[PDB]
Design a protein around this ligand. Structure first.
Ligand SMILES: Fc1cnccc1Nc1nc(-c2cccc(C(F)(F)F)n2)nc2[nH]ccc12
Length: 304
C-alpha cells in the first residue's frame, strides 16, 4: 500500500538544486516528484529525509513528503526522496512566466508566510514538533500549487531546535545558503549561531526578498515590473559573499521599493512587510506568525 521506489517510473527531468536531481515520475497512475542522489551524497539525502520525517511537520504550505528509499538498477544504487508533484514548479519559474493579480500576490505571500510560520513553530507535548529554521529560503525553493498557493521545499540545510536543552540538532556551518539571500548578520558573520532564534530571523530577511520578487509581478491596470532576482541592480550573477556584504552590510542597501506600490493598499501592506523583514537588526524583524496574521486580515478584506 505504501509508496516505494521500485513502483515508480521516471518520465521527465525537472531540474537540479544544490544536491539531487529532480524528476517527474508516475506511481500507481499518479504523478510524483523524485529527487535522486548518488551513493556518495548519502549524508545530504539522509539529512533531507530526516527533516521531512519530523513529527507534525506536514502542512498545506510545506512540500508533501512521501518516502525515502533506495533503488538498485543492477550496476549502482540511487538514493531517492519522493514528494507530491506540482506542475507549476518553483515560484521563481511561476513569477518569470506570469504576472499576478492583487488577489494572486496576496495568495502567494500569505501561503509562503503560513508555511514558514509552521516550520518555525515549536509544539510542546507528547507528539510535539521542534522549531525548524530553513537556512536557504528563496523563490527557487518555494513551489506553486494548482490553487495558486505556495509550499516550501528544499529542507536539506534546515536546523531543528530542542527547547528543553536549548540545543540545535547539528553543529551548524557558517554561510551555507544562497549568497544573494543571506541576511546581513550571516554575510558579516556577526550571527550568534548558539541562539536558534538567530536562524528564524535570517529566514525572515530572505522571505522579505521573496515578497519583493512577487510584488514586482503584481499587475494593476496593466502596470507591473519585469521579473528580477533581489539585488539584480547591484551585484553580478552568482555573487560572492564579499560582493553581497559590501552592498547589504557596508552600503546598507536593500531592493528598491517603487513609487507605484503606494497607490494600492495591498502593495502598501506588502512594502511595509518587506521593510520590516529587512532591518539589519534581526531582533526588530516581524515574525512569520505576525506576517501570516497581517496578510490573513488583508485576504479577508479583499475577499480571496
Ligand atoms: F519543480 C517541482 C515540481 N513538483 C514538485 C517538486 C518540484 N521541485 C522540487 N522538488 C524537490 C523535491 C522533490 C522530491 C522530493 C523532495 C523531498 F523529499 F526532499 F521533499 N524534494 N526539491 C526541490 N527543491 C527546490 C525545488 C524542488
Amino acid at each position: 500500500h505504501m509508496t516505494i521506489a521500485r513502483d515508480i517510473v521516471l518520465q521527465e527531468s525537472i531540474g537540479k538544486g544544490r544536491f539531487g536531481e529532480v524528476w517527474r515520475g508516475k506511481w500507481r497512475g499518479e504523478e510524483v516528484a523524485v529527487k535522486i542522489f548518488s551513493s556518495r551524497e548519502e549524508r545530504s539525502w539522509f539529512r533531507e529525509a530526516e527533516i521531512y520525517q519530523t513529527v507534525m511537520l506536514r502542512h498545506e504550505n510545506i512540500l508533501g513528503f512521501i518516502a525515502a528509499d533506495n533503488k538498485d538498477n543492477g550496476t549502482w544504487t540511487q538514493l531517492w526522496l519522493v514528494s507530491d508533484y506540482h506542475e507549476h514548479g518553483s515560484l521563481f519559474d511561476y513569477l518569470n512566466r506570469y504576472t499576478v493579480t492583487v488577489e494572486g500576490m496576496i495568495k502567494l505571500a500569505l501561503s509562503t508566510a503560513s508555511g514558514l510560520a509552521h516550520l518555525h513553530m515549536e509544539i510542546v507535548g507528547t507528539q510535539g514538533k521542534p522549531a525548524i529554521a530553513h537556512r536557504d529560503l528563496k523563490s527557487k525553493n518555494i513551489l506553486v500549487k494548482k490553487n495558486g498557493t505556495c509550499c516550501i521545499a528544499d529542507l536539506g540545510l534546515a536546523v531543528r531546535h530542542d527547547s528543553a536543552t536549548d540545543t540545535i540538532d547539528i553543529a551548524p556551518n557558517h554561510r551555507v545558503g544562497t549568497k544573494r539571500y543571506m541576511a546581513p548578520e550571516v554575510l558579516d558573520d556577526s550571527i550568534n549561531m548558539k541562539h536558534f532564534e538567530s536562524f528564524k530571523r535570517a529566514d525572515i530577511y530572505a522571505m522579505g526578498l521573496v515578497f519583493w520578487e512577487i510584488a514586482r509581478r503584481c499587475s494593476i491596470g496593466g502596470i507591473h515590473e519585469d521579473y528580477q532576482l533581489p539585488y539584480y541592480d547591484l551585484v553580478p550573477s552568482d555573487p560572492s559573499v564579499e560582493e553581497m556584504r559590501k552592498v547589504v552590510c557596508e552600503q546598507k542597501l536593500r531592493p528598491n521599493i517603487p513609487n507605484r506600490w503606494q497607490s494600492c493598499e495591498a502593495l502598501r501592506v506588502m512594502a511595509k512587510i518587506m521593510r520590516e523583514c529587512w532591518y539589519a537588526n534581526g531582533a526588530a524583524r516581524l515574525t512569520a506568525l505576525r506576517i501570516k496574521k497581517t496578510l490573513s486580515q488583508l485576504s479577508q478584506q479583499e475577499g480571496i
